[PDB]
Design a protein around this nucleic acid. Structure first.
Ligand code: ZN
Lengths: 71, 94, 121, 116
RNA sequence: UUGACCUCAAAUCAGGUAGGACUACGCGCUGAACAAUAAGCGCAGGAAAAGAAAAUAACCAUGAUUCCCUCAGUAACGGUGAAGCGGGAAAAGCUCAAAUUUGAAAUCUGGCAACAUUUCUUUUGUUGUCCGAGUUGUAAUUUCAAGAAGCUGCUUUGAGUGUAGACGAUCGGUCUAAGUUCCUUGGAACAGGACGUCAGAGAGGGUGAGAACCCCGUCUUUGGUCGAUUGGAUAUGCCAUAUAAAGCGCUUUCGAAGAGUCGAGUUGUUUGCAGCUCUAAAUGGGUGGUCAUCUAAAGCUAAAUAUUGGCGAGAGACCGAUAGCGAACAAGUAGAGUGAUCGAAAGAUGAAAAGAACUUUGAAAAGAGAGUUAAAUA
RNA sequence: UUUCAAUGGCCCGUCUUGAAACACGGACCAAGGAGUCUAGCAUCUAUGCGAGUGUUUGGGUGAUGAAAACCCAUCCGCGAA
RNA sequence: AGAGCAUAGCUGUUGGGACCCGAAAGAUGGUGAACCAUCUAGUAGCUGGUUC
RNA sequence: GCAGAUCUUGGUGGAAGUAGC
RNA sequence: AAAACUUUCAGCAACGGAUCUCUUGGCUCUCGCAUCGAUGAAGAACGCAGCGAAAUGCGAUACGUAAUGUGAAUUGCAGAAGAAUCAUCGAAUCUUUGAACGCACUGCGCCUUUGGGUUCUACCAAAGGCAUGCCUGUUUGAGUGUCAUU
């Protein structure tokens, strides 16, 4: 084989010789994306995962990110 | 259609629906209490300013004006003193 | 299921003493269910997981409240006992320093403020 | 790119709601400031009179309004414009004077220390 | 020598901050082919950018920026293609450097100690003290529109903290008209016929077939009510470091204005910009037609404007399962490819599962007798 | 309708070519499948007004959908010259 | 002794993808001479088709 | 508004129970 | 010439999924709003659902806990009687990765503190920490420095 899993995206695109993922650009900090890959971008953008924290932020904006205990 | 918008369509969680759509309702008046008491909430601000005897614009109006019913020399400009103006309405007198 | 009302009027040591008794009880039911468990065992587990969670909450609630009281009126407090909101909100100018003006500007708004007026038609 | 004007009636409504929003905040004072009367700068238009940006300092001095008071009662000041003739001066001095006649200025509370 | 100052380092020292993601709109840099073009790279916000004239004009002159209409398919150029004026939307102005506070660094961060305050025990400050920063310059004052200093007599004044109520905004509760009468058909009445009711409600949806009156709702509501969090005002109590600070007026006194920039030569990118060589002035310099206008080489700034993304919302002379998004359903899923990437097909029993008990043939799958249903030509 | 009898009847479309010959396309059926939208110009007709004419950049206004309808301040375009 | 101006329709015409299907690409950026994505609906005097 | 585009998608035939395995 | 076979027509049964009807979907337009991340984001992985086809939800407190509200459900089963596979939501929790941060990328560690224990000096386990650039300050020490220095 020529590829293995990736520590960042888990997709089998991590080249062995160069130790560089062909999907997400690992181990570089900036994730690999290209404006001509419109369909590819839609396959991994925001919203394709849990969005666990971002959903919490949207829920908390309505009341102004308030804290404390209700009376 | 977006993966983010499809995600909340496939979820069981409800949307963060905010019922704020209220058109044709005009802003309520604060600031002056005298204006607030005599301000009606249906008429426009032009109609309310005219009814209360005030001027909405000290300049020209860049359009027509509604017609609801059919109608029935430097010395004298510098040394002069204009004698104020009468109050057309009880609000202006107030 | 133990209620949070009477789970909040006892000390932590006995409150933590209720932790492990529920822990082996939950562990014991798992031993019973793998060797044959009725519908009650599934519920008895379901009741006790939430029961463990309820008492774990009041341990963590009281421990934080103890930390909040201890770090009251202190300049620097742990990051856990701080606002979160958003990262940008924590970096924005505070309302106090957004209201700062030079003494030149204070004299402008003191002697020449925007007046409240009206025009007679 | 093709620009479409489907939001044309929605911009009309949005702009009118801003005038109502502005008038709610400043209840009795006009929604616009008084503008001067100037003449356009060409041989094609110098006969017409239109509205300017603000009143000159020489027009405000004659009318009796200082350039610091002027901005506070809704009179814009144009430091750039000047009066090359006496007709422009008198046309806009009278405009300021008429404005002051029709104007009610509500009094402001003033901080007053005990002594000194 | 002690010791100050300047360095150069160190610390798992204290307090901070940057990265990555999104990128519809926005601002830079870069760039081919068939043009600031796609791509590539860099950086933001709720808008961004621009912005208070080194601007137009040649007039009776205009007056920051931005956007729309017009100018105009015009001038000009070699088919490209503006701008001034004009009409609208919106309007708001300002801050430094260059002055000796010199009769008094008047300025600021931090540590510590109290006192407050909160969208908040999470936030944000005040007072006191010590240390540090700072005279190689922190405040007050000044920005050309001026201004300073004197003089003069008129008009002025809070960066304070509570209480009360009113007026607004935001969030969460609560309040709400009238047939399920009679006859017929039907499995079912929501149909037809008769007799009635409500209507500021005859939108829409659900319910066993076309329901204003069965249900949720709709109207009232452009509000009553109960709380919670807030904004700008009003009224009023207290406090107020005013020996102060301003505007206007007057002059036998003064008035600083940004340089490897402007500009010149030359070479490249697309006039602007960039490199390279050279390199200024002080009624000087810029841009225009002797004259007019502006005052660069420092900075900030809401609104009108944009918005295939994000959080919601309301719609439509749109498509109606080979259509409309690739995807109405396990859809960027299954699946394919080493990988980059590629990427489907697939909606409908009935009102109700009442989803065919039971007997029988068969190794079984199934079949036949039955059975349910208005209908198994569901 | 089926079938019989009498008489007649060369496979359709495209291109070619006087014409055909041709060479092409056609196993069959269902569904889909091609002069559209928009900017400018010119002719003609209709409609409105007429030495005039054009409301919709915008403003005013519109409580029963308010993206509609209704109203028109200043310009400007094209004509008259 | 001015006949225009505005709107609608018809027709013709010129641009845009421009009746539809059709011709090797080239360029940019990637993946392991090759492969992939976009520019692209690139370029057609020509081919086939073009519905009562 | 279809009969054609070696049209597109789907279904289905003769060849054929043939070639063959 | 009847049969068979072939052809045509019709009936019934297959085959197929057209048409019709609709539809919690798409598409388009308009309107309101401004809210990611070292306080660990987007994404990826692995786990938890008594069973869930997946899908969704959640994070060892695992289809959630606290609080508030409604007030009696859940449902294909099952399960509890402030119940709910509910809504709101200010409090807690949130596994391994990932800008990903002790070094590495499986493992190997460092310092400190705490504790074990029937094996107590130590060892062991756990916890707390331990990335880089840069800004302000603090502390410490060097200098080939400038002096000061009778
Ligand atoms: Zn990867």
């Amino acid at each position: 084989k020529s590829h293995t899993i990736c520590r960042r995206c888990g997709k089998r695109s991590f080249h062995i010789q160069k130790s560089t993922c062909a999907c997400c650009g690992y181990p570089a900090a900036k994730t690999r994306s290209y404006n001509w890959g419109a369909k590819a971008k839609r396959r991994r953008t925001t919203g394709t995962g849990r969005m666990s924290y971002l959903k919490k932020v949207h829920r908390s904006f309505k009341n102004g990110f308030r804290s404390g205990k209700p009376a | 259609a977006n993966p983010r918008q499809r995600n909340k369509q496939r979820s069981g969680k409800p949307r963060l629906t905010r019922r704020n759509a209220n058109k044709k309702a005009k802003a309520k008046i604060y600031g002056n209490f005298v204006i607030q008491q005599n301000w009606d909430k249906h008429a426009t601000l032009r109609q309310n300013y005219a009814r209360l005897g005030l001027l909405a614009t000290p300049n020209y109006v860049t359009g027509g004006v509604e017609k609801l019913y059919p109608d029935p020399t430097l010395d004298d400009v510098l040394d002069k003193e204009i004698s104020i103006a009468p109050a057309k309405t009880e609000v202006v007198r107030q | 299921a133990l209620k949070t009302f009477e789970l909040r009027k006892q000390s932590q040591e006995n409150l933590a003493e209720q932790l492990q008794e529920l822990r082996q009880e939950l562990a014991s039911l798992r031993v019973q269910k793998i060797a044959g468990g009725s519908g009650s065992k599934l519920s008895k587990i379901k009741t006790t997981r939430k029961d463990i969670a309820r008492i774990l909450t009041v341990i963590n609630e009281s421990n934080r409240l103890a930390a909040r009281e201890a770090y009251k009126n202190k300049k620097y407090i742990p990051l856990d006992l701080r606002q979160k909101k958003t990262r940008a909100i924590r970096r924005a100018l505070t309302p106090y320093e957004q209201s700062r003006k030079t003494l030149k500007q204070i004299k402008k708004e003191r002697y020449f403020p925007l007046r409240k007026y009206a025009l007679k038609a | 790119y093709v620009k479409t004007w489907f939001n044309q009636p929605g911009r009309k409504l949005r702009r009118r709601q801003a005038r109502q929003t502005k008038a709610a905040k400043i209840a009795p004072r006009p929604v616009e400031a008084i503008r001067p009367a100037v003449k356009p700068p060409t041989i094609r238009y110098n006969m017409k009179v239109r509205a300017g940006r603000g009143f000159t300092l020489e027009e405000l001095k004659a009318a009796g309004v200082s350039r610091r008071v002027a901005s506070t009662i809704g009179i814009p000041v144009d430091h750039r414009r000047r009066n090359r003739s006496e007709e422009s001066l008198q046309r806009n001095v009278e405009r300021i004077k008429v404005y002051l006649a029709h104007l009610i200025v509500f009094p402001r509370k003033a901080g007053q220390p005990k002594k000194g």
